[PDB]
Amino acid sequence: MADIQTERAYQKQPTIFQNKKRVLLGETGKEKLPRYYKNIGLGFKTPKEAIEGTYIDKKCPFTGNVSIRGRILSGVVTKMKMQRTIVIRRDYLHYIRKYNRFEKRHKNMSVHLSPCFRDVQIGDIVTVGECRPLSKTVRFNVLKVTKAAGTKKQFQKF
Amino acid sequence: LVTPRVLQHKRRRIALKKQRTKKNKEEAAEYAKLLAKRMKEAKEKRQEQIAKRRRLSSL
């Protein structure tokens, strides 16, 4: 937060300016930064954690430029071992009409994950949404994380 | 070589320009009347709403 730079360049949000008006705070006060966020719409809600916290990322939709428009999908976490993204999976069933049986098939996809969510673990349900391309194999972003399935992450007393 | 025919095309050229300016006048006139009309209905509605609120407060 007090360090968010490690680059060879300065990191900041667009649509923010630093005024040089008035002078009198005493000790400390306004961190000289109002926060930027926006609504996503479609019944999805911005996290409190985004508005509270400090990160500079342009590829998350709660802060940076990128819309969610078109499709909405789900998935599940399978792996995370990359920075500001994850890998996910989609289990589904393919039918054959000669037989009357189904069979299992899965694909894997990457998708970008905001620094807002940091409570992710491998095995959580995840929700995603169609976006403009961000990268070669990223076309999506997260909208929501949830856990509501068998063998939960922490003991029942919630 | 200038002839009378030449000058007509230049006179009609400017007649259209003036006609155009007169038309953008009259449109904005009518729209202002219409716009200013609504500033009335809206006000009335607001007043009604206020009255309703007062009534509700009553009890």
Binding site: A9, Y10, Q18, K20 | -
Partner: protein, 206 residues
């Protein structure tokens, strides 16, 4: 020729795809501008759908701004100091978006002196007294004080700013693509950026 295709390059699995359609005009490169600082040379490039695109080579003026008190004046672009994409570009004095460059700093003082009625950092007051005091002192009756009173205590001007006027240079940030626009433009550094890039400059060189 030099192209910006996408039907080359491996897929995720390390697979290759065999040659498909021949190169086309809407997937196309055209070599880099590589614009410097010098006397203005501009080339007009025909581009797709019409709507000509200006490529600027060797600019020497850009329209920077001081949005703290909202004045923007045309000023000369002296030299490059920091280029946050590469180290080599600074050495050959290449000018691209988000560089850090130097300016003359002249009209910003003229604007300040006339509007806030105070000079910046100065070598001596001896220079001022015969001429450049003629503007600063004023003969108004009535609006010697009446205008200027409202300008007072809105001109604290910060420490890192004031010291730079004395050198005659200021650090501003290119916020344009000169190779696409045909113009250099930008904003001048303030606040925490201006603290940051100083430290990078002193770190890297010297």
């Amino acid at each position: 020729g030099i192209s910006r295709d996408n039907w080359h390059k491996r897929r995720k699995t390390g697979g290759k795809r065999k040659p498909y359609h021949k190169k086309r005009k809407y997937e196309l490169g055209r070599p880099a501008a590589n614009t410097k600082i010098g006397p203005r040379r501009i080339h007009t490039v025909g581009v797709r759908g019409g709507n000509k695109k200006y490529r600027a080579l060797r600019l020497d003026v850009g329209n920077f701004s001081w949005g703290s008190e909202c004045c923007t004046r045309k000023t000369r672009i002296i030299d490059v100091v920091y280029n946050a994409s590469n180290n080599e570009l600074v050495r050959t004095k290449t000018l691209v978006k988000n560089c850090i460059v130097l300016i003359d700093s002249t009209p910003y003082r003229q604007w300040y002196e006339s509007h806030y009625a105070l000079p910046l950092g100065r070598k001596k007051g001896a220079k001022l007294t015969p001429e450049e005091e003629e503007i600063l002192n004023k003969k108004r009756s009535k609006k010697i004080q009446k205008k200027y009173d409202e300008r007072k205590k809105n001109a604290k001007i910060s420490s890192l700013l004031e010291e730079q006027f004395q050198q005659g240079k200021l650090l501003a940030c290119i916020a344009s693509r000169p190779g696409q626009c045909g113009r250099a433009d930008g904003y001048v550094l303030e606040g925490k950026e201006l603290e940051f890039y100083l430290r990078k400059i002193k770190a890297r060189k010297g």
